[model samples]
Target: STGSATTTPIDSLDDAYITPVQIGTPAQTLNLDFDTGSSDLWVFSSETTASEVDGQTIYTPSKSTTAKLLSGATWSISYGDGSSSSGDVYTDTVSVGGLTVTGQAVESAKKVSSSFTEDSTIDGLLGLAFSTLNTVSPTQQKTFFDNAKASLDSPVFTADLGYHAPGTYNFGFIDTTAYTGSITYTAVSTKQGFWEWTSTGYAVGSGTFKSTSIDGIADTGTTLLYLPATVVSAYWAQVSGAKSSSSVGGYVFPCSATLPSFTFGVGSARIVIPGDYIDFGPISTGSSSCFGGIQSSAGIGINIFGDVALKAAFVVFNGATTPTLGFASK
Candidate 1:
């Protein structure tokens, strides 16, 4: 049986737009979004009319000798962000780094909506995240790891964020040196595309907010870090001489002086977020001030540790090796 879906695709362009994973011997790159919510590697292709494919990158099959379109298969995908893309199916030699995998299934969007065509910079996404929610069926189903595992030097993959710049997302070998010590492994559930954890409580400025203890999940799909309402309010309360400022429909504080360090309990692990991450953006009157990392999800129920928290450690989704997820330092 396949492991839990927890793979993330790499973005191709520097704009955080779309990036393609290379396929074939010389390597032909196909633009894709790495989504943990699904378990497929798809790309937009030439069959899709230019008018229908906007904002997204469309691959020119003529440019690559190794590209092959699937005869009868069709594909459609919807994202958690409410964005969706659909297209025909194709098979190709896809590559990541120097490793090349063949007969890889991909999608070529034949039609796209304005929301997907307008804002998104890249053409398609690479579903490297998890596969519990995959729409594909059995027998015909395939994932990037399933195809590339044999070609990999190691069963591990590493994602290196480029200090707010364009970073390299590497697969195959785990760069142990990029992380600090031993890696922590966590078992994954197949419900939502999230890594869930029960927190003991929270602490700010050396003070524990015992009243706001709660359970939460870490999600890379989400852009912002979401905290419970009570915990959010309690956190802002600790700001000395804090004044209400408006931003992102949340509370903001003035003066970074004496900024507090916030720590969240993950089992025996205590992950501390620095004070600087709490710095809020500009203020507005009617809107709540926005803190750098923490924000209110209102009634979203589950709190999410977004990219901000994940960046602190090296994450590994061992779908090819073990059923557990791995985390290490970078």
Candidate 2:
């Protein structure tokens, strides 16, 4: 049967949207960050050092009737921002939204870094990237989507992200009513285990479209959209008072500065990023400084279409052998 999961944005902080999943025999439900950027399903668990868990809910695999250790197996993951977690492996049934998959691999964190430990709202991450990116030792594990796709009527998923609002994450089926206009399609290359694609180019505001092919990934787990430093500099050049500041992280401008709209071309799909979105928000409360939502991709390994960019379009993530990305206006 096809499945769908509705996600809710966290209050105040719209950086990440969360969905609940049930695990094991008795079904311990936990809120998970649906990260399309990485591969690996891991969670705060009983295995974690008490001091490291803080306010996060710890998964008790030992309490789950169906939990079984993947003897001698381990998993470890780190994000570009230095967030990391390392853990032992467990196999158990995992239920996403309402779809159930047996023998799913669940990494239970035994050690975590400050980034993972400090964010209490994020109990774990549910990766939507290619299965080959899974961090399991000896044998890689399939995602909850892959395991369920075998029985699905459609091997697809849709990410409908909202701007400071709630949205839905549908699996195995696309909710046509959620988007307007036709969905423009593009083939994705999973060569780097990401939803990577090249955009024809970009433009600032209503200016003529540029023609630089940009390779980037659609990453739901990231908060900011990133591009080549050269491209970023060109875009910022049009914004008055905009300056690159390592002290502030990325680019910054006067909070009151009027910004221009940004647009990226994919074949004929002209995905636009409103001017307001590019102005992330004031650097700090009561400050007249604002950090840019779009910035340099340097050091990140690749450009990324993060939440700031994803929210601008209704996206379809096709998990076929040659994966495809479908985009439409929201």
Among all candidates shown, the one with the greatest TM-score: 2
Residue 154 error, candidate 2, Å: 0.7
lDDT agreement with native, every candidate: 0.57, 0.86
Single out the weakest 10-residue window by summed lDDT for candidate 1: 1-10
| Model 2 agreement with the true structure over 1-330: per-residue lDDT tens digits | 776777777545466887888888898888889999888999899999888987887789989999999998899998888889998999999887677888989999999999878888888999999888999997888887778777877888889988878788888888889888889888799889899988889998889998989999999989888999988898899888999988988899888888888898877878898887776677889889888988999977799999888888999999876789998887
Cα lDDT of model 1 by residue, 112-196, tens digit: 6666567555556666555544444333546676666666666555544432344445666666676777776666554564445
TM per model? 0.74, 0.96
Span of 10 residues, lowest total lDDT, candidate 2? 6-15
